[PDB]
Design a protein around this ligand. Structure first.
Ligand SMILES: [K+]
Ligand SMILES: [K+]
Ligand SMILES: [K+]
Ligand SMILES: [Mg+2]
Ligand SMILES: [Mg+2]
Ligand SMILES: [Mg+2]
Ligand SMILES: [Mg+2]
Ligand SMILES: [Mg+2]
Ligand SMILES: [Mg+2]
Ligand SMILES: [Mg+2]
Ligand SMILES: [Mg+2]
Ligand SMILES: [Mg+2]
Ligand SMILES: [Mg+2]
Ligand SMILES: [Mg+2]
Ligand SMILES: [Mg+2]
Ligand SMILES: [Mg+2]
Ligand SMILES: [Mg+2]
Ligand SMILES: [Mg+2]
Ligand SMILES: [Mg+2]
Ligand SMILES: [Mg+2]
Ligand SMILES: [Mg+2]
Ligand SMILES: [Mg+2]
Ligand SMILES: [Mg+2]
Ligand SMILES: [Mg+2]
Ligand SMILES: [Mg+2]
Ligand SMILES: [Mg+2]
Ligand SMILES: [Mg+2]
Ligand SMILES: [Mg+2]
Ligand SMILES: [Mg+2]
Ligand SMILES: [Mg+2]
Ligand SMILES: [Mg+2]
Ligand SMILES: [Mg+2]
Ligand SMILES: [Mg+2]
Ligand SMILES: [Mg+2]
Ligand SMILES: [Mg+2]
Ligand SMILES: [Mg+2]
Ligand SMILES: [Mg+2]
Ligand SMILES: [Mg+2]
Ligand SMILES: [Mg+2]
Ligand SMILES: [Mg+2]
Ligand SMILES: [Mg+2]
Ligand SMILES: [Mg+2]
Ligand SMILES: [Mg+2]
Ligand SMILES: [Mg+2]
Ligand SMILES: [Mg+2]
Ligand SMILES: [Mg+2]
Ligand SMILES: [Mg+2]
Ligand SMILES: [Mg+2]
Ligand SMILES: [Mg+2]
Ligand SMILES: [Mg+2]
Ligand code: NA
Ligand code: NA
Ligand code: NA
Ligand code: NA
Ligand code: NA
Ligand code: NA
Ligand SMILES: [Zn+2]
Lengths: 68, 109, 197, 158, 97
RNA sequence: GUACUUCUCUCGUACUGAAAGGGAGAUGCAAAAUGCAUCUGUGGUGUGCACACGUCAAAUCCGUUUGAUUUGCCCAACACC
RNA sequence: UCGAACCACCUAGUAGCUGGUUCACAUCGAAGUUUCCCUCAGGAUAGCUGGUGCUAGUAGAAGUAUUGUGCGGUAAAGCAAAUGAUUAGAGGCUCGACCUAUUCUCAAACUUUAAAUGUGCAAACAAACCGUGCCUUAGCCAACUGCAAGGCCGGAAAGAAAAGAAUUAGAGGCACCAAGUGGGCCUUCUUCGGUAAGCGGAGCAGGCGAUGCGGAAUGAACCGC
RNA sequence: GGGCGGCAUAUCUGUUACACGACAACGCAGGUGUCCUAAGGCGAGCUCAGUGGGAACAGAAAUCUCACGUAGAACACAAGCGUAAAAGCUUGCUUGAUUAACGAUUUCCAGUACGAAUCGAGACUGCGAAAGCAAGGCCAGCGAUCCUUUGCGAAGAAUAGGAAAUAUGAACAAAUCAUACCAGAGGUGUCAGAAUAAUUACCACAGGGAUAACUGGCUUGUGGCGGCCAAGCGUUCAUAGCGACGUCGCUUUUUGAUCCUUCGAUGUCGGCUCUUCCUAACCUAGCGCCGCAGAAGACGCUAAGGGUUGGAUUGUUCACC
RNA sequence: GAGUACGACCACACUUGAGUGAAAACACCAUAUCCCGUCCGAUUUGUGAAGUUAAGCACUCACAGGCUCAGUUAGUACUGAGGUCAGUGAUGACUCGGGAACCCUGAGUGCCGUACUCCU
């Protein structure tokens, strides 16, 4: 007994019932995994120095607040 | 559907359940409080019969085996003849005065 | 008729009564329902909302976590101002990894015996929410805190573990089982550890 | 019957325009593509290396990675009830700098120039008026609009 | 397919770490050992009554096998294995046409 | 039945490798094939309750309170490291 | 009782198949489609749906416009343009051929050209713009004050003018646990096979199924609602 | 329907497909399980298919030469696309068809594998004067678990498992042997992957009107019955009578197509018997027209009231006498 | 007002005939010991400067063929939305919107950079 082969009749209605959700904004899930390696390695060294500077800046702010 | 569940391994494929066609294979514990009372009642009766001898015969202290339990201590089966001889007791006479004797246990320390 | 297709999808599940059978929980809800309605305090509104939540949605907090966050607030805080009262709508648990803590005033639904002993021995004090309403009726000088829930085994199990980028733990009592095919490159394939989103 | 290979049904999509054949020129080679730029993914059928799938032809996205010969583009693609951000790897010959933000950049630059003129006291340009307002019209040529007999004969061929 | 009897290819071993001359030998599977673990399990399962206990494949469809070539280093004596595409006639030929 | 007891057992506080077997703090100084020193401490950054400083607008029964916002700390969470 | 007797038991044998399945109201409310399967009367799996919620109630909003900027080769049109098909005169070099310019008529697997309807992106609050600003890099460059990148410190912000210069019964996102369904059918336009069919088979979207009511006397699908 | 056939079962190109993407049929036109140490890689030089003019044999067609030549050739295959100081042809050198630290991604898609792809990073190379270009022949040409089988863990160094020595056979050691970890190979073509011949009219069960055999319903190709136009036939003369080439319909008294109803059953051929209805009229009642003298007849109109047989052969309907 | 080298766009730049060309260039051109390559110094390579604008090259011309931009074709073909619109159908018109193509015809026949040189 033959039956129906394929259809897309109601699929658009089902998809839009909860809506076609918009894409994740570019500022989230912006991982650089798998990108060009030499730039990634160079950026890692910069970020490590930035973390050290961030630690020093907070130490200075703590001392400044304590003194004042 | 089935969904995300653990893969079942309930192991209940034999004729364990008693039914119209199966005698079953089960063990219940409905008599547990009664057996506890009976065991205590028997112990009290045994104490009366053997009075004034202690209910439980004297047993030695032993070290639990394996590296997992070597720090623990517990009672062993019976006193070795070497321990009894050092204490000044003939092992056959010791068994007559309520001392358990084990001729299998060695004294390695 | 009015075209209102999918209007029911706007509705959200908002609970107004606790599922808890605790009479003392109900007394606190009665107290802070009145305070949230009759006072202009964001603290009172949040505390009342959190008193209705389920036990799983009231995560426990550790004493070490409380001590750390107060220290972060204690620095950059004027020397003439008193430290705020740590307020937790939930259980407060002791931490054996922090031996030394400062003296803090902590209000919580419940304290563990060790946690209460640690707080008192450090020179602090433990408060119940009726005392908190008496001395801070609007929540002035309070530090509202929440416990952690993302480290729970239930959360770690959520999601399918066989899809690329997933690192959820499977539902298996036997750790050694379910380790060969789909988990190793040498057995057909290995599920990809990372996937861009 | 119909098959589902990588380039199935691309007879007209992956083809050069008439009298516009040839490999890409120096201008494409000298184009600078940066991470964060908007690009349009247009396949160049004369290259055939690094060539995107037919779906991504004519789509615009953000560059997330640059390699010596390739460009990684983030393209929105609706699937079922959601939109996915697909990272496609192509060669630089299949990407062109996008002008989707041209109007917005001009608007921002115009605002800065207007602000600079205001802060410097320079006279502001006059504001354009609406063409939808009422007014008096003085005609220079008035003609009768009507259907003529010759119009019906003019639409009868043979 | 005609394949050269010698190939100049990189050698990964520390002794060479350079392009070297490799001798070419086509791979042939060894004889199935009687005391292999799977063979021992199979023989135990087969013993006794019950007939054939494992599937016996009959619906062969391939007309070719993938060619595997074993490259032996001139100095290292180590062997590397490479896979070629399926073919019906593989010969090692030095005479270039 | 209720009341009482357990150097035990079990699930967890640690995870990894096929195994032999190894096994996770921070900061500072410095780069020692186990580097030293200190122990009141979110490893860093972005977004983020309440609370604390202020600051605008609306409305007041003139007591204030309804929003928004600057800064600080940011709880829970989410995302890059 | 016989193409494997009768009796008891294993046996409540198994069945993706047939039949049945017991009170009320209330808030919501489908699917007959995707992929895999000895799969096609069944399942897993996404989708649709309910419940539980979480998160700072307009935050990462939109089955819609406008503007800017991309993508296209169907409808048409063309054969006096390529590829195929095709009718007939004429002029050059009694016939014919050959060449030249035309002519009659065509194409789902032909096209120079080319819509309508579409489709991707952008339209200022984690952003972007300005500074001979600063710090770091084992990054580029022959170097650098240039370039690439991650930050820091300041500045400016019609918070997006004017020119038709948007609108919103726009709380955005994030999970968790699950049900039924996975035979469909009809219709406007598009559309394939067939002489055709209340025939078979697709696309976009509505509808029935699951739904009565008011109409077309009567009708699951038509009209109105 | 099933069977037979075919394969639409895994897969590639064009078209169907409605100018994003995606889309069915046992729709249309064709392909694939191979082939290549070069037909792979690179550099250089060259230009192809065809035309035209010219040169002993030489002619349509051998080779030489000069012009034109947007590709009308060629690129292993089927097709599309692409390519001219090349991607084609010739040639010189080569092994980038090796290895590649579980990098990321596309196509299918559940955003899983498999197969093909894309962009990299590292090693060692090839070609080139150099920028560069290559990890096969662009895009089809292929394969899980278990099992089997092969490769790698060279030698020597370490007072001690470390930065650097593969591990296990659990009382401990040596040498064998067997395991283990990583990467391939032997294959499932029903191609996400059972190890399979018939027959039943002696037949059985669970079910299906999801599905055939019989009525009915939709079609009406086929069958049947007509109309229109007028080349011819009719001595003559298109139309008394009929009507080629075409074309427009009706009918459901034939077959077919379909599978909507019925498979917890609608008794399935023919005849006998009996009633009724239809008219496209055989006889009977009237009436036109004729190649209607008469007689016998052709054609046509209104009309279904009435009538329409006995037998041989065949179960036959039908057919024939 | 021109030339040369490298160029961007790649016919408004191409194609066919005809004419003109200051200076400097460019180019033909001369030649084969050496570098190098061919059957052939034709190509290519090296070394040169006696000659020529004859060609290339550059400008101009043609009721030139193409090409480019416009008009026309034409609000036509087609098309989004609508009707208990017309018609037995085939199909068509109308309503609110969008809107082609060829033929034909008008105009045009490269443009913009860096460096050096000529006119100077
Ligand atoms: K489901
Ligand atoms: K012991
Ligand atoms: K086995
Ligand atoms: Mg179905
Ligand atoms: Mg579950
Ligand atoms: Mg944890
Ligand atoms: Mg097409
Ligand atoms: Mg195209
Ligand atoms: Mg390989
Ligand atoms: Mg754990
Ligand atoms: Mg039962
Ligand atoms: Mg079934
Ligand atoms: Mg039922
Ligand atoms: Mg409802
Ligand atoms: Mg059923
Ligand atoms: Mg057409
Ligand atoms: Mg045309
Ligand atoms: Mg033609
Ligand atoms: Mg657009
Ligand atoms: Mg405006
Ligand atoms: Mg009615
Ligand atoms: Mg379309
Ligand atoms: Mg398409
Ligand atoms: Mg070349
Ligand atoms: Mg990977
Ligand atoms: Mg291939
Ligand atoms: Mg190929
Ligand atoms: Mg390839
Ligand atoms: Mg060794
Ligand atoms: Mg199969
Ligand atoms: Mg296969
Ligand atoms: Mg399969
Ligand atoms: Mg299978
Ligand atoms: Mg018989
Ligand atoms: Mg039955
Ligand atoms: Mg039949
Ligand atoms: Mg008929
Ligand atoms: Mg006829
Ligand atoms: Mg039926
Ligand atoms: Mg039946
Ligand atoms: Mg019945
Ligand atoms: Mg009956
Ligand atoms: Mg009649
Ligand atoms: Mg009659
Ligand atoms: Mg009668
Ligand atoms: Mg001169
Ligand atoms: Mg010469
Ligand atoms: Mg000249
Ligand atoms: Mg001249
Ligand atoms: Mg002209
Ligand atoms: Na399901
Ligand atoms: Na109807
Ligand atoms: Na490489
Ligand atoms: Na295999
Ligand atoms: Na039927
Ligand atoms: Na008569
Ligand atoms: Zn070697």
């Amino acid at each position: 007994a033959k039956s129906k082969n394929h259809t897309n009749h109601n699929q658009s209605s089902k998809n839009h019932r909860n809506g076609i959700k918009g894409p994740v904004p570019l500022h989230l899930h912006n991982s650089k995994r798998g990108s060009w390696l030499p730039a990634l390695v160079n950026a890692r060294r910069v970020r490590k120095h930035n973390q050290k500077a961030a630690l020093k800046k907070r130490r200075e702010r703590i001392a400044a607040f304590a003194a004042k | 559907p089935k969904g995300n569940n653990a893969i079942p391994h309930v192991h209940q494929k034999k004729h364990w359940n008693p039914c119209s066609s199966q005698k079953g294979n089960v063990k219940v514990f409905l008599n547990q409080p009664a057996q506890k009372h009976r065991r205590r009642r028997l112990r009290l009766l045994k104490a009366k019969k053997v009075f004034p001898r202690p209910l439980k015969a004297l047993r030695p202290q032993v070290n639990c085996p394996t590296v997992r339990h070597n720090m623990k201590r517990r009672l062993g089966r019976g006193f070795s003849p070497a321990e009894l001889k050092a204490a000044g007791l003939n092992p056959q006479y010791a068994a007559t005065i309520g001392i358990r004797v084990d001729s299998r246990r060695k004294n390695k320390s | 008729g009015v075209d209102l297709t999918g209007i029911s999808k706007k509705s959200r599940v908002i609970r107004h009564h606790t599922y808890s059978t605790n009479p003392y929980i109900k007394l606190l809800i009665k107290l802070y329902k009145f305070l949230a309605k009759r006072t202009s305090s964001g603290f009172n509104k949040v505390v009342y909302q959190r008193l209705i939540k389920s036990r799983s949605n009231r995560a426990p907090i550790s004493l070490s976590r409380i001590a750390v966050v107060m220290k972060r607030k204690a620095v950059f805080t004027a020397k003439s101002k008193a430290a705020p009262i740590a307020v937790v709508v939930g259980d407060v648990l002791d931490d054996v990894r922090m031996a030394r803590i400062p003296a803090m005033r902590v209000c919580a639904l419940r304290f563990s015996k060790s946690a209460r002993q640690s707080i008192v021995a450090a020179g602090g004090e433990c408060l119940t929410f009726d005392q908190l309403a008496m001395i801070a009726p609007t929540g002035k000088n309070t530090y509202l805190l929440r416990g952690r829930k993302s480290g729970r085994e239930s959360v770690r199990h959520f999601g399918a573990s066989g899809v690329p980028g997933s690192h959820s733990k499977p539902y298996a009592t036997n750790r050694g089982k379910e380790t060969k095919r789909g988990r190793r490159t040498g057995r057909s394939y290995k599920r990809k550890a990372f996937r861009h989103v | 019957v119909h098959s589902y290979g990588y380039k199935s049904g691309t007879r007209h999509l992956f083809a050069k325009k008439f009298r516009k054949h040839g490999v890409p020129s120096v201008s494409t080679i000298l184009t600078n593509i940066k991470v964060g730029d908007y690009v349009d993914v247009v396949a160049d059928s004369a290259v055939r290396e690094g060539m995107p799938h037919k779906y991504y032809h004519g789509r615009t996205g953000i560059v997330w990675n640059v390699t010596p010969r390739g460009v990684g583009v983030i393209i929105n693609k609706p699937v079922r009830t959601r939109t996915l951000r697909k990272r496609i790897c192509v060669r630089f010959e299949h990407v062109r700098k996008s002008r989707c933000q041209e109007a917005f950049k001009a608007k921002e630059h115009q605002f800065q120039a207007y602000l600079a003129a205001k802060k410097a006291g320079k006279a502001l340009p006059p504001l354009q008026k609406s063409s939808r307002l009422g007014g008096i019209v003085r005609p220079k040529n008035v003609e009768v609009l009507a259907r003529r007999v010759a119009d019906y004969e003019a639409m009868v061929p043979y | 397919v005609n394949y050269p009897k010698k190939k100049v290819m990189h050698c990964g071993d520390a002794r060479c770490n350079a392009h070297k001359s490799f001798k070419v030998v086509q791979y042939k599977a060894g004889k199935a050992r009687l005391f292999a673990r799977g063979k021992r399990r199979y023989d135990r399962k087969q013993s006794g009554y019950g007939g054939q206990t494992k599937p016996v494949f009959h619906k062969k469809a391939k007309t070719t096998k993938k060619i595997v070539l074993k490259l032996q280093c001139s100095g290292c004596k180590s062997i590397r294995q490479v896979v070629l595409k399926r073919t019906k006639h593989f010969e090692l030929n030095d005479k270039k046409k």
